[PDB]
Every structure is written in structure tokens, then in C-alpha cells.
Design a protein around this nucleic acid. Structure first.
Ligand SMILES: Nc1ncnc2c1ncn2[C@@H]1O[C@H](COP(=O)(O)OC[C@@H](N)Cc2ccccc2)[C@@H](O)[C@H]1O
Ligand SMILES: Nc1ncnc2c1ncn2[C@@H]1O[C@H](COP(=O)(O)OC[C@@H](N)Cc2ccccc2)[C@@H](O)[C@H]1O
Ligand SMILES: [Mg+2]
Lengths: 780, 336, 250, 73
RNA sequence: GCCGAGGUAGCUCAGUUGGUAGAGCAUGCGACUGAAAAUCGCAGUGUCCGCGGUUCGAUUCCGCGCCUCGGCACCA
């Protein structure tokens, strides 16, 4: 919200400086995004009085005769250029910010133009440039420098959180600075009303949308441009003056965050009717935009006899037709409180965001209407010499705020402060509360405008802030946590250790968007996502990932394309989605492999990974083995499942060739387990100090058989006294049958208490040869 | 084979181009009926048929060799990278430290070779001290050895091997100022015949919390927390009076081990003794530092790591830790 | 990953203050992300987060007590929902910090993402004051920028904390105030929504006589400033040349 | 050690990597000699680089490799 | 949900009297090496966003919707 320092300083007279105000608003709950000086007006621009505007024949231009102290003429193509208004005359030799090159005497369509009459854009007071500024013809003595009556201003840019719609009005904002001890000056709308009947009737048909609706009646109006202080103020706040009436409505709105709108009675008909738009009805709003109306739009309509037409999009923006102009003498002033939701909906339905809707959405004082009507009516009487009526037209009877039980004891308990009761009650009373209490728990009833104060905690907040969060002391709580909180962080320290361990061996951690490309569902041969999005950043990021590798792999391609990593071992721990959210660990190997920077002999591929992985769970002290399984995304030749502590939890293999080919990628290996990994409790076990009888023994087996089944069998029948095992060599050669291979194991037996005799080992080494036969294997 | 079947793109390109974009191009557009279309045709009739055919041809030629060739016994042992592990003493220490870390304690270490001043004197254990016999001091002899005290200054005195970590209480206080919470793990050495539950070289864990307002209730709370974290909610601590020259209201403590229904005696404890505070500040003057432990109080505690470890990991005999057996160690690869 | 190096350090920092580290799900229900946090429908204040809505039949989202939680599925727009979940599960007193990846709908830039990480801190208990909330941040500050550091609290709004605040830590080695996160004393209605949910699950109320504070900070932004990464889009980028840079931050 | 120290040194700032992809002590080489084949890699921060720049560097590496006392197969 | 600009070969990207869909490292066989590199011809993985048009190989008129950006309106 733009906050013109001087505008504020009008309600809060003693403000120190734009700087201090920002410091002040800071502690109050509003931070300023920026501060800036705004109306640098060179000495070259003076006030002038359009004596006469003469149309240059043949052109669309005008020769203006202006009283600029002495008389001068200027040429202008501005439609709004007419006789009897004041203007910002830039004399020849003036340096304008808005158009940088030096203004001077120039001949145009036959007339020695003496400088030019500026426009909002040209003076640098607003972005508008479709007309000249329009000052009150008698604004200043012809020729006086404009700055002399239009000083450089300072505007703060304040962030106004939703819990402070009262703050979308400087008089409201001002009320907070007051509580800090700043003198407050509320304008005293000085009305001179006349007890006479209103020429129109009110007929609120949707009290649900217009909980409180009031209409004013000002007549015998003399529409003209606003005085400079008004025009200057509106501009600093980001708005452009338009006249007498319209300006006072906007002024008040900004002042007390209460949108209002002057409807011209010529168009009001018999009376104003606040109803919903008849599904169909058309309305051309102020922006010149011709719109259709959704039957849910709350309309401000007028009726004539048996007719009914819209006049304005209630709470959002007035209608183009009934807006007040120069030839208007009487108006019907709208000042109401509209259903926040209705406005919200409608505003967006028509893609409109006004100063009006913005406030009606956030929240309007449920009982600030009438005071507002007088402020506007007063001002209209003073700037438009209007003759305000005495009676309003109300529709709705809102109930003032209820009391809130407030214990300054708790305030100090909840804050860790020890503010004396007195300071608290005092503050609360400065923010406009009624503290009807005796102690210890008072009956605090807040101001109609504080929508953010319903609870006793709300109130305690008011003390902290007005007292200064910087006054709340530092401390540290000490207590024994409830028992169901012990060890709650195991799941965490577990996974963390994990990562840490991986990062040990050599894996590079990697984070990847939870998003998934629906296409990759086919591209990597996976099942389509169950959770999709209703608002994807991009179809590529349309669904939620069901695996971690599609990404791990993609980050690879992307690497090899920006840089060409000769090799890469990666890993990622992330949340996957599918039936249920579940944590996964993913890995990825690729490149030359591990060996000697020189000596061509490299160690890599599938078994390099299974290498690390076995080495991995080795570290975690967990059972690990792979058992070939078909996985639609892995080379059929190299693809199995992973078995941690006996239970299956993922897979390990090489990416399906057909795939690598599409993503134009070399061969690659990976795995993707599911967390949390099994939990094996440790059982210490004293190791025997008696020598381990160990013997070798090959096992001729048929080529199709997996080393897994072989060992499983050998170890099994190998007996309990079996310490180790091991596979020191696999041979598929000459002295062996067709389609066969021998697995030479290095066994090792051992007894706890005493040494063992070879008569025992044989009775075992044999038991291993017997089942090795009963099954169907040889024994070289 | 397509490697060339690709290059043919210019073999067919430029060559065929020597028909249209090579035969008067500033007039070719004025000739469009048939001839141009001859290429517009062949240019399409060839690019699609050719370039793609050769592709998909090999796309099913190369991708075919692999699918068939590459056949591995997945369940076959892989590269034998090494798999590390951590000593049991460390697994424990770490957990103890993480336990006290959560209570706001700082973990700092001290030297193993101390001076008779920090190990005994500053701790209130003067010469021929009757109470100087719970520790069986290892005396050292070495010229050219530079032992250095807290403020990096050269500390004098008869060198030895600290018989407990408590001397880190004296050192850390002349260095820092209160309030603070410290736990200082460390290897200590004593002269006693070893057995199933005894060593000559073992580890302790000091805990020192100095500060104004510190009470024995706070000392008891710590142990109560040490207890919980180690044996769950169903755990409880037991404090019984005992003597140490450096803590007046002294105590020995035990933690209740539910999963075993037995009281374990962990360590000593108590409120820091008046003369240790005196010895500290007193030492500081000597070093020109203002006194700092005049208006404070504080508690210390010291426990046997191994014994906790033993009971905690089930190691029957204490002489295993420093044994060196890989068959023993490797057992703990995975305690997290 | 840098996000982890940081998270870890943050967690180790709060761990030393007695906080417990627990995580929650990324795919939430409109009940835990908004409602139980006091952010009803068409909520004007429901616009600081630009919710990612989901659609999925056969998906089984499960609440605290492992029960099937119903509601419109979505991606949590902050970790704060772990405040509601952890309270229906445990009983006070307790100190928790729950790190986690959150998702918002906003165009990305040098200091913004659509997917980023926060860090919740919830300390409920009878006798808990804002002074305690301020002490934590004061500790977070020290541990991160040394003794010469200091914190700054300014009022701000959140529907789930009444006395709300936004905080900044003073960065000496750079002479600049950094805005870390939001904070404040847990709001009366969150305690109400929790216990209220418990009844529904037949558990006795537990947050009736207590008070407590919460805070939530942006990890990446802290990381960025902490590791010097100029642009926030680097973390999730994937560049090995970027990552490898942090091999050694301990 | 000395070889690389020298190559990297004079290899210029724009030098990203280096690497030793092979050490050869064989036939086509003098007596008591060996060749170290390095896989260099240069890179510029803002824009791409022209081979006229790399040479003016790959060379600077060959010049000091001579001023010292090493060959360059 | 308004004006206006870009979105093209493992990558960085200009472009438009058009024969250039390409230039700058980088990349594919012979052959100089044992194995490479500085090399000489010989060549283009490119749907120049996607659905549809556009000349003899189209990027560009031209249609609507998409990745990107400034401003704008909100406020992370
Ligand atoms: N040989 C040994 N092997 C294993 N543990 C041993 C040991 N000798 C002692 N311990 C352990 O060391 C613990 C403490 O050692 P102790 O000599 O009894 O007291 C030593 C004091 N320095 C501890 C203390 C500090 C602060 C305040 C009060 C007391 C014992 O409780 C015991 O469990
Ligand atoms: N796109 C983005 N990229 C990086 N950091 C971001 C971000 N959006 C938000 N953040 C970080 O997230 C922090 C908090 O998120 P915000 O939405 O502002 O508050 C979110 C509340 N859930 C935090 C809170 C908890 C408890 C009590 C009070 C407040 C911010 O301070 C900011 O540093
Ligand atoms: Mg409030």
C-alpha cells in the first residue's frame, strides 16, 4: 500500500521522518518494501490560467491563451484542454523528468507555442498522459511556481497483512502509531445538513451480500477539479484525480479503508436496488469495458417504474454511465459493507482487482459506514459546495463487537514478560478498546474496525507489539519430555547415518524434483502415476515420481551433455509416490570404472556396483544377495532383485539397452531399494581361539545354474562347525562337460571349545558332496 | 555398416544437389512444375526411406547383439571393495556424547600424559594422601618432553598418565568462564591386574556443569536422563553417598536396567568441591586471569565407558576391546 | 548434497537444545495443511502458499495414528502440518524440529523455487513463553554466526500462531540482516483442532493446559547465504560440478 | 609428480582438468625413458574458446616442457 | 490472466541481398600410435516448442495452445 508520508503526517502530526516512520511501522507489524521522493517539479513549471482555448483550423490542435502572470499562448492537442481550468505550464527552458529534453519556444501549426502545458506523465506525478493536469482555475496566482504549492513528497511502500484490513486506510494505520504515544488528529467532518426527503428509495434484495448498506444524498453540486492538496495526495498514493466528487470518494476510501461511490441521480431512477445480476444482464464499467454478468454477481441497480438496470459492480467497480461528471448536480452516495466472499469470487470471475474489491475482500469496518458517509458528505460540501441532506438510507443492523476476557496476568505469562497491568490497560485503551474491568480478568471489547481481535491471545499480541517485541526477554525452557517422546528421532538418525555411510564408500548424493514426466512412464517402462497434478508447472512436471532412477539417469544424460564425466557413481534418497508415499534409496554407476589411471586393466560394471553394495550392507551388518528377476527396465541378461536380510526390497542390474539407446546413453547400472532397511539386532558371539580346519573343493555345475543356489546348498549341508565359505574361482573350461562350470569354494570349519579332527570335517565335507549329488551336481 | 550409410547424406546430397541448387538458382524458382518436384519427391522419397531404414535396421541389429550376448549370473559375487567399521569403544562413546549433547553438553578432550598438579593436587588429593589410593598411578620419566597446560603455557610437575579424566575439569575451567556444560571422554590408565571386568587402560566420561544456581537436583536429573536414553522410560537411577576429594556431597550412581532386572553401578558424581574452584581461580591469578568461579557452584560425574559398553553390547570380557581381534571388531560393523 | 549438509547442521544445532528430529509426508491432506492450522476455505490468508493440488484414486494417504486420513490430497506448502500430526501422536512436554521438502506454485528465479526445504520447530508445554521462542532463535543465531550475532523479531501474521512474528539473524561477517523464517506462540485453535482430532480417535485431550511456540525456516536460503551459492536453482539442478564442490564440508 | 606439476603450471588458467590416462615405457621411445599421456581440458567462464587460444596454451606447455628437459611425442 | 520479446546439431548460440539450416569444439573411421594427440576429409545425431500449411532441403508467415523473461496486478 502506498503511504504518502505527509498524508499520514496529517493525522499523525508529530512523525519524525520517513525513516523513523518505517522503523515505527516495522515494530508495529508492517515492513516497507521501499521509500521514495516523488514530485521534483522544476522552477520552470508554473500555474497558469486557461483564458481561452482556440481551435487551430485544419488541425486537431488548440491555441491556448493562458494567464501565466503575463499572457502567453501554447498549442495543445489534449482533449481535456478547455477554458477556465488551471494547468501546469512548463516555460521554455525547463528540464522535465518525464520527457528529458529541454522544453522551449516552438512554432506549431502557425503559433509561437510558449512552452507547453504538461500532463500527469510529463510532470512526473503520474503515469497518465492522455490529458493535462486540471487544477482549480483559481488554485494559485497566475505565474507562481508550481512546487511552491506542490512540494516533493516521500512515499513508503507498506506490506499490509490480511489480519489488518483496518490498515488499508491511513487513518487506521495512524491509529496504531497513536498507541505508541503519537498524537492523533481525526478529521472532523463538519456537515451543515438540511432536514429534507431523499429523491430516491433503497431496496436491498440480497442482505446476505450487503450486510450493511447506506446511501447518501448530496445535491446542488458544483463539479470541478480538486484543489492541489487533494490532487497531490491522490497521486502520491498511486491514484489519478478526476474531479471534485469522484476524488473525495477515493480520498476517503484511502483514508479510512471504506470504498464508496457517487452515483449520478439522473441515472439512479426511482431508487437504488442492491440485487444479484440477472443471468444475462450487461454492464459497461468505468474502465470502458463492456461486460456480461454471471447471475452470482452482486449488483448495484436502479429501477424505473417496472424496469431495472445495473449501475455498478457492487464492491468492485462503478458503472461507466452513471459516473459523476461536470454536468451532475445530485448524487446517491454508496457506502456499504459487502460480503467478502461474494466480492472475492466476482472480482476474479471478471479478472478485476480494484482498490475497492481489494478492501471489500480483506474486510471493511462493519460499523464504519455512517461515520464515513459524513466525512464524504462534509468534504463534498466543502469542495463541491454541495448541499448535503440530513438523513441517510440504512439497510442492515450489524452487531457491535463482543467482549474478550483479558487477563494481563496471562499476557505476561504467555509472553515471558512482566509488563505492569497499568501499561497493558492503557495501551489497549489507546487502540480504542473499552476495558470494562475490575481485575484480574477484564472485559475488553475492541473497536468495530479491528477484525483481527476476537481472542484473548489477540489482545496479548497488541501489548507485545505496542510494547515492542524487543522488550520480550530471552529465555530457555527446562523440562523432562513426556515419555511417549523418547527416541522419536530414531527413524531420522537412522536414514541420516545411512546417507553418511553411502557418502563414505564413494557415492555422490543427488536431489531430484519429486515431479515426473508422464511420458517417462513409457520411456522407462513403468506403470503410470496414480497421483497426478491438476496444475503442473509444465506437462513434463505433470505427475508425481514413482521411482528414483528415471531421474538419477536423466541427471546423468544432462551431465554428459554439459560436461562429459568420464565416470560417475551416484545415489539419491527421496520420497516416491504410489498407493502410498515411501522412501527409497537409488544408486547409479557408469563410465570406465575403477582401476589405474594408466594400466588399461579396469574393474567395473554390474559387479563393480554389486561390489560397493555388498561392501555397503557389509558396513551396516545386513544380509545381502541378488536373485535374477525380470524388471521391464533392465537388461534381461543382467537383472535381479535385491534381498536385504532375506526380505526382498528392490532390484539391481543394468538399464535396458533399448532404453539407453533412446536417451542416447551408454551402458549403465543401478539399483533402487526401499527404506527403511531391515533391522538386525546384534548378538555378540565370542570367536573360538581354536584353529579353523579349512579345505578347498570345486563343484562342477551346469552353466545355466546360478551361483546363488550352489552356495545356498553347500553352506546349508556344510554343517554348523562351518566358519567361512568363499568362492575363489569360477571355471568354465576344457576338462569339464558341455555347458558346465566349476565353482571352487574355500571352506573353513571351526569348533568353539577344542580343536577338531579331520575325521569330523570329512564327515561334513562329505555331507556336502552327498547333497551335492542328491541334487544334481558333480565334485571335481 | 551404416556409419557410411549415414555419410551418404552428402553423397546423395551435394551430388544430387548438382541438379537443382547447382544449375542456375537465380532462375530455378521460375522453373517449378515437374523438375523441382522431381527432387521435392526424391528428396523426400529418399531421406525417409533411406536414413530411417538403415537406422531401425541397426536399431535392431546392435540392440540385438547385446540382448543375446550380455547374460550374467547376477547372483554372482562382485568386486571386493573393503567394508570399514568402528571400534566398540567409539560406538559407545559416540552414543554417550550424543546423549549428553542433547542436554546441552559440549564435548572436549584433554591429554593422556598429565602433571601431578592437574591429576591430584588441583583435585584435592595431596601427597601420601590416604584417598590417593583408588587410582594406582603410572609414573613417567622423560627429558625433552614438553607437557603444556590449558593456556598453552608450559605446565610443570611430576609427569604421569592421568588416572581419570577429571583433570579436564581443572583444565577446562582455567580456560573458559561459566556457565557451561561439558563432557570430556578419554582414555585413562591405572595400575591394576586385569581380569574379566578390569583393565589397566580404559575409558571414562567426565561431565562438568558449573554455574550459579546449579544444584545436586540438576546432577540427578542428568543421570536420570542418561538412564532413560539408555534403557527407555522404564529406567531409573540410584544415588548413594560415597567419597571423592573433589566433590563435597559426593555420590556413586547406578542405573536400573529393565531388560535385565539389575542395578548397574556406572560412575561417581557430586557437587564440585569448594577447593577445586579455589585451585582453579587460584591457578588463573598465577596466569593473570581474573577469578571466575567465585560465585558459582556445579556438578561433575565420571563413568566407565567399557563397562557400559560391555553391558550394552554384551561383551563378556573387558580385555577384548584392546585385544585387536578382527573377528571381534567386525562384529560391530553396523551398530548404526 | 548441500541441502543435507545444512539441514544436518541445523538439526545438530537444535539437537543441542533438546529438540527431537522427526519427519512427515510430502503429500498431505487439506486438513493438516490448512484446516487444522486455521486457514479455512477462500481464506484470504490462504494465499501466501500457492497450493499444488493432486488427483489419485487408489492412493492411501495415512494420518498420525496410522489411520486413513480423508480430504483433498495435495503437496504440503510448508512443514507446519507436522505440528498437527506430531501432537495427536504424542503428549507434552516436548521439543521437535521437523525438516522436510515442501512444494509451492510460484515462478522460480535467483532466490526462489517451486520445490524447497523448511525446518519446523515446535515446543509445547505448560509454562512456555515467547521469551523461550526468542531464546531459541538467539541460540540458532549464535551457533551459526558466532557470539557477535543477534536476532530481530518483528510482528507478522500466520493463522496458526497468535503473537506472530518474523525473524532475522544478524550476520556479522557480512553486516546484513537476514530474514530467516516465521515464528510465534502456537494459536489457541491449533491446540483445539489437535485435541479435537484426538477425541475423534478416542484419545484423551492433552493440549488443554499448555502453551507453546513454533518457528519455520527456509533451508536453502540459509544454505545459500551459508555456502555462498548465488542461485537457488542449483540445488535441484543436478550438476556434478556443483555438488562435488561441497565434498568436505566436514 | 614433477611432470604434472609443470604441465598444470604452464597449462594456463583456463585449464579445467588434467589427468594421466596412461604411462608408457616402450619401444618407440629412447633408452631409460617413459611417456606420460595427459588428458587435458580447458574452459572459459563467459564464452566458448577458439583453438587459437588453446594452442597458445598447449604450446606454452610444450615450451616449458623443453626449457626444462622433456620431450613431447 | 494485458502490452511486448526469445524459444534452431553432445554443448554456447548469431542469424536472415537464402543456398548457410550452420559457426566455435565436441563427435563418428583410416591411416601417422604400442595406446592417443596437434592432423588431411569423408560426414550430420538435429522432429529450428507440438498439432496443421508453406520453397527443389522451410527456421522465418501464418493459426491456437505450450518452456523463457520484463513490466503489470500481488506480495515469496
Ligand atoms: N579398570 C577399569 N575397567 C573398566 N572400568 C573401570 C575401571 N576402573 C574404573 N572404571 C569405571 O570408572 C568409573 C569411575 O572411576 P572412579 O575412579 O571410580 O571415579 C573416578 C572419578 N574421576 C569420577 C568422578 C568425577 C566427578 C565427580 C565424582 C566422581 C567407575 O564407576 C567404573 O565403572
Ligand atoms: N520459494 C522459496 N525458496 C526458498 N525459501 C523459501 C521459499 N518460500 C519460502 N521460503 C522460506 O520459508 C520461510 C517460511 O515460510 P513461510 O511461508 O513464510 O512461513 C511458513 C510457516 N509454515 C512457518 C511458520 C511456522 C510456525 C510459526 C510461524 C511460521 C521463509 O522465511 C523463507 O525464508
Ligand atoms: Mg491479531
Amino acid at each position: 500500500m502506498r503511504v504518502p508520508f505527509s498524508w499520514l503526517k496529517a493525522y499523525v502530526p508529530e512523525l519524525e521522518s520517513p525513516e523513523v516512520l518505517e522503523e515505527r511501522l516495522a515494530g508495529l507489524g508492517f515492513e516497507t518494501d521501499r521509500i521514495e521522493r516523488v514530485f521534483p517539479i522544476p522552477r520552470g513549471v508554473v500555474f497558469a490560467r486557461v483564458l481561452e482555448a482556440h481551435p487551430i483550423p485544419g488541425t486537431r490542435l488548440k491555441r491556448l491563451v493562458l494567464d501565466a502572470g503575463r499572457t502567453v499562448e501554447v498549442v495543445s492537442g489534449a482533449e481535456n484542454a478547455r477554458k477556465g481550468i488551471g494547468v501546469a505550464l512548463a516555460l521554455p527552458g525547463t528540464e522535465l523528468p518525464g520527457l528529458g529534453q529541454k522544453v522551449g519556444e516552438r512554432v506549431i501549426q502557425g503559433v509561437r507555442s510558449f512552452g507547453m502545458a504538461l500532463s500527469p506523465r510529463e510532470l512526473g506525478v503520474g503515469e497518465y498522459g492522455g490529458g493535462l493536469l486540471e487544477f482549480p482555475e483559481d488554485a494559485l496566482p497566475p505565474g507562481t511556481p508550481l512546487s511552491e504549492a506542490w512540494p516533493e513528497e516521500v512515499v513508503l511502500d507498506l506490506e499490509v497483512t490480511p489480519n489488518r484490513p483496518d490498515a488499508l486506510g491511513l487513518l487506521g494505520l495512524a491509529r496504531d502509531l497513536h498507541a505508541l504515544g503519537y498524537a492523533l488528529v481525526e478529521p472532523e467532518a463538519a456537515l451543515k445538513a438540511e432536514a429534507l426527503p431523499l429523491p430516491f428509495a433503497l431496496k436491498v434484495e440480497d442482505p446476505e451480500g450487503a450486510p450493511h448498506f447506506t446511501l447518501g444524498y448530496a445535491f446542488g453540486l458544483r463539479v470541478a477539479p480538486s484543489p492541489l492538496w487533494m490532487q497531490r495526495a491522490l497521486f502520491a498514493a498511486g491514484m489519478r484525480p478526476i474531479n471534485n466528487v469522484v476524488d473525495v470518494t477515493n480520498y476517503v476510501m484511502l483514508e479510512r479503508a471504506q470504498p464508496m461511490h457517487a452515483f449520478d441521480l439522473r441515472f439512479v431512477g426511482e431508487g437504488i436496488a442492491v440485487r444479484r445480476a440477472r443471468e444475462g444482464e450487461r454492464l459497461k464499467t468505468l474502465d470502458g469495458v463492456e461486460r456480461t454478468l454471471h447471475p452470482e454477481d452482486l449488483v448495484i441497480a436502479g429501477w424505473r417504474g417496472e424496469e431495472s438496470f445495473p449501475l455498478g459492480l457492487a464492491g468492485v467497480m462503478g458503472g461507466a454511465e452513471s459516473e459523476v461528471r461536470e454536468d451532475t448536480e445530485a448524487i446517491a452516495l454508496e457506502v456499504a459493507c459487502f460480503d467478502p466472499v461474494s466480492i472475492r469470487k466476482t472480482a476474479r470471475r471478471h479478472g478485476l482487482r480494484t482498490e475497492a474489491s481489494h478492501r471489500f475482500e480483506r474486510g471493511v469496518d462493519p460499523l464504519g459506514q455512517v461515520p464515513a458517509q459524513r466525512r464524504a458528505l462534509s468534504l463534498l460540501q466543502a469542495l463541491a459546495g454541495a448541499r448535503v441532506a440530513e438523513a441517510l438510507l440504512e439497510a442492515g443492523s450489524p452487531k457491535p463487537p463482543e467482549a474478550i476476557p483479558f487477563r494481563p496476568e496471562y499476557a505476561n505469562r504467555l509472553l515471558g514478560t512482566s509488563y505492569p497491568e497499568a501499561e497493558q490497560i492503557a495501551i489497549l485503551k489507546r487502540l480504542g478498546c473499552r476495558v470494562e474491568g475490575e481485575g484480574p480478568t477484564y472485559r475488553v471489547t475492541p473497536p468495530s474496525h479491528r477484525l483481527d481481535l476476537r481472542l484473548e491471545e489477540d489482545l496479548v499480541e497488541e501489548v507485545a507489539r505496542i510494547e515492542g517485541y524487543e522488550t520480550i526477554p530471552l529465555a530457555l525452557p527446562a523440562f523432562f519430555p513426556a515419555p511417549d517422546n523418547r527416541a522419536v528421532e530414531a527413524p531420522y538418525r537412522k536414514e541420516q547415518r545411512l546417507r553418511e555411510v553411502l557418502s563414505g564408500l564413494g557415492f555422490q548424493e543427488v536431489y531430484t524434483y519429486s515431479f515426473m514426466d508422464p511420458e517417462d512412464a513409457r520411456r522407462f517402462r513403468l506403470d503410470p502415476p496414480r497421483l497426478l497434478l491438476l496444475n503442473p508447472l509444465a506437462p513434463e512436471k505433470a505427475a508425481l515420481r514413482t521411482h528414483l532412477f528415471p531421474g538419477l539417469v536423466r541427471v546423468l544424460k544432462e551431465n554428459l551433455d554439459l560436461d562429459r564425466p568420464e565416470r560417475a557413481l551416484l545415489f539419491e534418497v527421496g520420497r516416491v509416490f504410489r498407493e502410498r508415499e515411501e522412501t527409497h534409496l537409488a544408486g547409479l554407476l557408469f563410465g570406465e570404472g575403477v582401476g589405474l589411471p594408466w594400466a588399461k586393466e579396469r574393474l567395473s560394471g554390474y559387479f563393480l556396483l554389486k561390489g560397493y553394495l555388498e561392501a555397503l550392507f557389509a558396513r551396516l551388518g545386513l544380509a545381502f544377495r541378488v536373485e535374477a528377476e525380470a524388471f521391464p527396465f533392465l537388461h534381461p541378461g543382467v537383472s535381479g532383485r535385491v534381498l536385504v536380510e532375506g526380505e526382498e526390497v528392490g532390484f539391481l542390474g543394468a538399464l535396458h539397452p533399448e532404453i539407453a539407446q533412446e536417451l542416447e546413453l551408454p551402458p549403465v547400472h543401478l539399483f533402487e531399494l526401499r527404506l527403511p532397511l531391515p533391522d538386525k539386532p546384534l548378538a555378540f558371539q565370542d570367536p573360538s581361539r581354536h584353529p579353523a580346519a579349512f579345505r578347498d573343493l570345486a563343484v562342477v555345475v551346469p552353466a545355466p545354474t546360478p551361483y546363488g543356489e550352489v552356495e545356498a546348498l553347500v553352506r546349508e549341508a556344510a554343517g554348523p562347525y562351518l566358519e567361512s565359505l568363499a568362492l575363489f574361482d569360477l571355471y568354465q573350461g576344457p576338462p569339464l562337460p558341455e555347458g558346465h562350470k566349476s565353482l571352487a569354494f574355500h571352506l573353513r570349519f571351526r569348533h568353539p571349545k577344542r580343536t577338531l579332527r579331520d575325521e569330523e570335517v570329512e564327515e561334513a565335507v562329505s555331507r556336502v558332496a552327498e547333497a551335492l549329488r542328491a541334487r544334481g551336481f558333480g565334485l571335481r | 555398416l551404416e556409419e557410411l550409410k549415414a555419410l551418404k547424406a552428402r553423397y546423395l546430397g551435394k551430388k544430387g544437389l548438382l541438379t537443382q541448387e547447382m544449375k542456375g538458382l537465380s532462375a530455378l524458382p521460375l522453373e517449378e512444375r515437374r523438375k523441382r518436384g522431381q527432387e521435392l519427391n526424391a528428396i523426400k522419397a529418399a531421406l525417409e526411406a533411406a536414413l530411417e531404414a538403415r537406422e531401425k535396421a541397426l536399431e535392431e541389429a546392435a540392440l540385438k547383439e547385446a540382448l543375446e550376448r550380455e547374460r550374467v549370473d547376477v547372483s554372482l559375487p562382485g568386486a571386493s571393495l573393503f567394508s570399514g567399521g568402528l571400534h566398540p569403544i567409539t560406538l559407545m562413546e559416540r552414543e554417550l556424547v550424543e546423549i549428553f549433547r542433547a542436554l546441552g553438553y559440549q564435548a572436549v578432550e584433554g591429554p593422556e600424559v598429565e602433571s601431578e598438579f592437574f591429576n591430584f593436587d588441583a583435585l584435592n588429593i595431596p601427597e601420601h594422601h590416604p584417598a590417593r589410593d583408588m587410582w594406582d598411578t603410572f609414573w613417567l620419566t622423560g627429558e625433552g618432553f614438553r607437557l603444556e597446560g590449558p593456556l598453552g603455557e608450559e605446565v610443570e610437575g611430576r609427569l604421569l598418565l592421568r588416572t581419570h579424566t577429571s583433570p579436564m575439569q581443572v583444565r577446562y575451567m582455567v580456560a573458559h568462564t561459566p556457565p557451561f556444560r561439558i563432557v570430556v571422554p578419554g582414555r585413562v590408565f591405572r595400575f591394576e591386574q586385569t581380569d574379566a571386568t578390569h583393565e589397566a587402560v580404559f575409558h571414562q566420561l567426565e561431565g562438568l556443569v558449573v554455574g550459579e544456581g546449579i544444584a545436586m537436583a540438576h546432577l540427578k536429573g542428568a543421570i536420570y536422563e542418561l538412564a532413560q536414553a539408555l534403557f527407555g522410560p522404564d529406567s531409573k537411577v540410584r544415588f548413594q553417598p560415597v567419597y571423592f576429594p573433589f566433590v563435597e556431597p559426593g555420590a556413586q550412581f547406578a542405573v536400573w536396567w529393565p531388560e535385565g532386572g539389575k542395578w548397574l553401578e556406572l560412575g561417581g558424581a557430586g557437587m564440585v568441591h569448594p577447593k577445586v574452584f579455589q585451585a582453579v581461580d587460584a591457578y588463573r591469578e598465577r596466569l593473570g586471569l581474573p577469578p571466575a568461579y567465585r560465585g558459582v557452584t556445579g556438578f561433575a560425574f565420571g563413568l566407565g565407558v567399557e563397562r557400559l559398553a560391555m553391558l550394552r553390547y554384551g561383551i563378556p570380557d573387558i580385555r577384548y576391546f584392546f585385544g585387536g581381534r578382527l573377528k571381534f571388531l567386525e562384529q560391530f560393523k553396523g551398530v548404526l
